[PDB]
Design a protein around this ligand. Structure first.
Ligand SMILES: CC(C)[C@H](Nc1ncnc2[nH]c(-c3ccn(C)c(=O)c3)cc12)c1ccc2c(c1)S(=O)(=O)CCC2
Length: 169
């Protein structure tokens, strides 16, 4: 079965959310597109990007290095489409702003806009965690910006509960 998302809570007609690890979701669901929370040089050194690369046994990093050699780095708020490997048909590498490194939070709208070129996506909460954005603000930007169908996997039950409570106010 295609895009077999299970156990999500529907927030709006096009945004769903689950307390789950995106890597485990990508193995179970086999989505058409999995979003990576990338950096501009596609160096998958930790967090979500490191976990998705490790699940591909480093095939994602080798492919990413070859892409950067030919095309140069991405811009903050930009994206590229590369192979999904064993995790998805395609990986959409999206660069949200890293507020902890001084990048502009306004670029988070441009980052989510990349999602609208794909009908269905499995994605993480952009710019949250160590990128420093307020995760409740990142969910609000996602809901207001994404028009295609997006399944958000957030690997922390405490944050999940705060995000669902905030949306339902
Ligand atoms: C907010 C947080 C709960 C969320 N975390 C995650 N959300 C969804 N699936 C996840 N898998 C893992 C994971 C991490 C270690 N290892 C070993 C794994 O195997 C699997 C993390 C994780 C998240 C959302 C966005 C971003 C980050 C973190 S960040 O800090 O990586 C910087 C980039 C933006």
């Amino acid at each position: 079965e295609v895009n077999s998302f299970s156990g999500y809570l529907k927030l709006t007609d096009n945004v769903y959310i689950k307390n789950a690890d995106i890597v485990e979701e990508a193995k179970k669901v086999k989505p058409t597109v999995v979003v990576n929370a990338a950096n501009v040089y596609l160096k998958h050194g930790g967090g979500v990007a490191g976990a998705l690369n490790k699940a591909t046994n480093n095939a994602m990093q080798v492919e990413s290095d070859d892409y950067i050699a030919t095309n140069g780095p991405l811009k903050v708020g930009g994206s590229c489409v590369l192979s999904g490997h064993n995790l998805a048909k395609h990986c959409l590498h999206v660069v949200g702003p890293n507020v902890n490194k001084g990048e502009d939070i306004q670029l988070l709208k441009s980052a989510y806009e990349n999602f609208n070129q794909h009908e269905v996506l499995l994605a993480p909460l952009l710019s949250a965690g160590i990128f420093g954005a307020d995760p409740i603000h990142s969910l609000r930007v996602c809901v207001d910006t994404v028009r295609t169908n997006v399944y958000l996997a957030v690997f922390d039950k405490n944050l999940y509960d705060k995000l669902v409570s905030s949306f339902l106010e």
